[PDB]
Design a protein around this ligand. Structure first.
Ligand SMILES: C[C@H]1C(=O)N(c2ccc(SC(F)(F)F)cc2)C(=O)N1Cc1ccnc2[nH]ccc12
Ligand code: NI
Length: 277
């Protein structure tokens, strides 16, 4: 969009309530949208916005990125509901994930022993999505607990809040003063040669596993960003989390195989888990 399609919807249908946080292209809100889900009058939505400052060509960056999600149909990726293109506010509508990001959820559980089952359950839902994504030649590049989203019924879905929430600023290194990088989630090949594949994603899934087991500790805590680079690229791995089940630690190690070709497909992982069930 360029070229509005059947996805285009009316600004009037979309009422915005409170804020969620800062997206790459502008703020993001809670809200409600009528006639966007069939057999359903009203729908709780995340309204993503561009900026009353940033003009046409970075307003197109935004829409054409969301044009990619039109292809998608996984109950385990966050759903595009519509677009609002013609008009100065310029916003995208998305199924509202009501329990927020998975890092926040896991941290909300700290201050009071999560079942192998519960964790295997989540890890399976996460791989469902990533399996679909990588199926459709889509490589996420920032798979992390902070980009997994939780539903009213505790279902996990792959999303992407972007690299720019105040709340997770310690999760990004500005390497070279070039882009923000999730250096703690990145494969040695992503770190050295800037290589991003479906297996760069399987590396980050292993880190997410680690996050699930730790109720979202900072990976490689006690290492500065430059030291993580050095550590991982030089063959270095994360330690087995305290009270981590073996099932789970051994997935993480398959995901952290140095040589990307030795790591498994999300399909391999879904297979691997779905026996333990
Ligand atoms: C910022 C908005 C958004 O644009 N995305 C998103 C971006 C790309 C894809 S496609 C991919 F998963 F990457 F493959 C999916 C979702 C989100 O997750 N968002 C956050 C979000 C969505 C819903 N409910 C929420 N609650 C609290 C936050 C929140
Ligand atoms: Ni499911």
């Amino acid at each position: 969009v360029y070229v509005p399609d059947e996805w285009e919807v009316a600004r009037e249908k979309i009422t915005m309530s409170r804020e969620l946080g800062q997206g790459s292209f502008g703020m993001v809100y809670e809200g409600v949208a009528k006639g966007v889900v069939k057999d359903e009058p009203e729908t709780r939505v995340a309204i993503k916005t561009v900026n009353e400052a940033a003009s046409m060509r970075e307003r197109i960056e935004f829409l054409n990125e969301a044009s990619v999600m039109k292809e998608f149909n996984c109950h385990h990726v966050v759903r595009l509901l519509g677009v609002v293109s013609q008009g100065q506010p310029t916003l995208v509508i998305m199924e509202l994930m009501t329990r927020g990001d998975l890092k926040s959820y896991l941290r909300s559980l700290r201050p009071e022993p999560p079942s192998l089952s519960k964790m295997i359950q989540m890890a399976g839902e996460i791989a469902d999505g990533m399996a679909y994504l990588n199926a459709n030649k889509f490589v996420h590049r920032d798979l992390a607990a902070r980009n997994c989203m939780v539903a009213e019924d505790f279902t996990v879905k792959i999303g992407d809040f972007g690299m720019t929430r105040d709340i997770y600023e310690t999760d990004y290194y500005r390497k070279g003063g070039k882009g923000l990088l999730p250096v703690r989630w990145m494969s040695p090949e992503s770190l050295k040669d800037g290589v991003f594949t479906t297996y760069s994603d399987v590396w980050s899934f292993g880190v997410v596993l680690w996050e699930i087991a730790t109720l979202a500790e900072q990976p490689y805590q006690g290492l500065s960003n430059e030291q993580v680079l050095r550590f991982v690229m030089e063959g270095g791995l994360l330690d087995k989390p305290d009270n981590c089940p073996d099932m789970l630690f051994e997935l993480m190690r398959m995901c952290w195989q140095y040589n990307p070709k030795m790591r498994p497909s999300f399909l391999e992982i879904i297979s691997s888990i779905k026996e333990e069930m």
